[PDB]
Amino acid sequence: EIPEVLVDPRSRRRYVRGRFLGKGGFAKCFEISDADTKEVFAGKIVPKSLLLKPHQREKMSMEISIHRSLAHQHVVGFHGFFEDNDFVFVVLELCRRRSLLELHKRRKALTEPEARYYLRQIVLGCQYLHRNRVIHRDLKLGNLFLNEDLEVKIGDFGLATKVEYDGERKKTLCGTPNYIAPEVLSKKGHSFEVDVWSIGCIMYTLLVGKPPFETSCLKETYLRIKKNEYSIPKHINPVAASLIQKMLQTDPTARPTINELLNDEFFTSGYIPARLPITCLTIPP
Amino acid sequence: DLGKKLLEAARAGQDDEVRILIANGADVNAVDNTGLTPLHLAAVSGHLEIVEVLLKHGADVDAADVYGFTPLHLAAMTGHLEIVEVLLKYGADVNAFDMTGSTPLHLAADEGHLEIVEVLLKYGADVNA
């Protein structure tokens, strides 16, 4: 049912639908080409039939309102949005090298310099989000996208929220995050520190090759989250092992802020490669 | 698991195990969760004997993974010259495009694998592809 050409009535730009990139929740993604400029973007296409109300509709609206306000080297670029009677069309920066998920599925545990290399970028993007009062709330391998230079771009603002006042405690989410922070499990509410928790889980996953808490049953998983039960294998280096611990603490206020995270020994010392070879998507450097 | 076993045997570079799995009827065109085939995994890993074995038993020379890498892309980027030749002899598309529109020659040039560039050119790689 999707149109072969996408016409934006506001901007006057039109886009030819191309290569299917993948589905995700309510949306399919295609490469789209500007018919005039020949520029290529990710066209995210959501049918209104699925925007049939509450958490899904305004998860579309909130997500658009948040994402469009953002502009950073490590955040997926927002190029615009429009709709016809059937679909909502979102025009995004095309990241041609998939995400950290595909990398993880192939590589499992990375070498530490690779992890450092990705994690610095993830932290810098997230720092920019926090400074603009946005909590992402669903950081995970699958929405940490890679461009052709293997630069990380944070996308998927469907669960994101804007801190509207200082000391605000968020109580609700528009869905279920991938890494549930322990404070989300509790009744006490949450703030910026949830993104630091999820970066902890990601850091663990990149270095260890498997997630910190996830077991085969959800009850046991959530219980371990609540109890801070996890184990960092001994082959993990002390500085990295210690930074994972700082992030993966039950008390949100015990964790480093995003800037303290960025300034960790892990990032200011240790090796960061100038270039990762494209081979790193498949075999260790 | 016959597809899975083969994928792992081809990755590990275990030559005898591969022959036995193929003789057992293992799918030479098995795919893993990011679209890698035994041929991909043998190519990227430099397992020359296995590449030839797979191709002789009709493995899809131009199968593309989640990135759009063919086994030729993966051999070219990792510098495995003998495999690049083999794949070419079995009709691998020299100008196959991944999802960035890169041919194996682009990828090899970027990794500094110049002898590969040279062979790919001899086999008719188009620089302006």
C-alpha–C-alpha distance, residues B103 and A29, integer Å: 24
Assigned CATH for B1-129: 1.25.40.20
C-alpha–C-alpha distance, residues B57 and B35, integer Å: 19
Question: Which of A277, A282, A283 is closest, CB to CB, to B111?
Answer: A277
CA closest to A285 among chain B residues: B78
Determine whether A195 is an active site residue.
no
Superfamily name with CATH number, domain A99-271: Transferase(Phosphotransferase) domain 1 (1.10.510.10)
Q: How many CB pairs under 8 A join A and B?
A: 33
Q: What's the reported resolution, in angstroms, to a tenth? A: 2.3
C-alpha–C-alpha distance, residues B121 and B115, integer Å: 10
C-alpha–C-alpha distance, residues A239 and A271, integer Å: 13
Give the active site residue among A36, A86, A138, A195: A138
CA closest to B67 among chain A residues: A97
Question: Residue A187: left if φ>0, alpha if ψ -120 to 50, beta else—which one?
Answer: alpha
C-alpha–C-alpha distance, residues A244 and A264, integer Å: 11
Q: Do B78 and A98 touch (CB under 8 A)?
A: no
B44: which chain A residues are within 8 Å (Cβ-Cβ)?
279, 282-283
CA closest to B100 among chain A residues: A96
Question: Which of A102, A148, A278 is closest, CB to CB, to B34?
Answer: A102
Least Cα separation, residue B39 to chain A (angstroms): 13
- Hey, which residues does A152 pair with through a beta bridge? A146
- Residue spans of the domains in chain A: they are 10-98, 99-271
Question: Which residue is it, tokens 């083969």?
Answer: B6
B8: which chain A residues are within 8 Å (Cβ-Cβ)?
none
Chain A contact residues (CB < 8 Å to B):
19, 96-98, 102, 105-106, 148, 277-279, 281-283
The method of structure determination was X-ray
In terms of Cβ atoms closer than 10 Å to its own Cβ (0-12, 13-18, 19+), residue A57 is middle
Q: Do A282 and B74 touch (CB under 8 A)?
A: yes
Contact A181, A252 (CB under 8 A): yes
Interface test with B, best of A30, A278, A281 (most B CBs within 10 A): A278
Assigned CATH for A10-98: 3.30.200.20
Kindly state the tokens that stand for A92.
Answer: 């995004």
Q: Do A283 and B44 touch (CB under 8 A)?
A: yes
User: Three-state SS across chain A?
Assistant: CCCCEEECCCCCCEEEEEEEEEEECCEEEEEEEECCCCCEEEEEEEEHHHCCCHHHHHHHHHHHHHHHCCCCCCECCEEEEEECCCEEEEEECCCCCCEHHHHHHHHCCCCHHHHHHHHHHHHHHHHHHHHCCEECCCCCHHHEEECCCCCEEECCCCCCEECCCCCCCECCCCCCCCCCCHHHHCCCCECCHHHHHHHHHHHHHHHHCCCCCCCCCHHHHHHHHHHCCCCCCCCCCHHHHHHHHHHCCCCHHHCCCHHHHHCCHHHHCCCCCCCCCHHHHCCCC
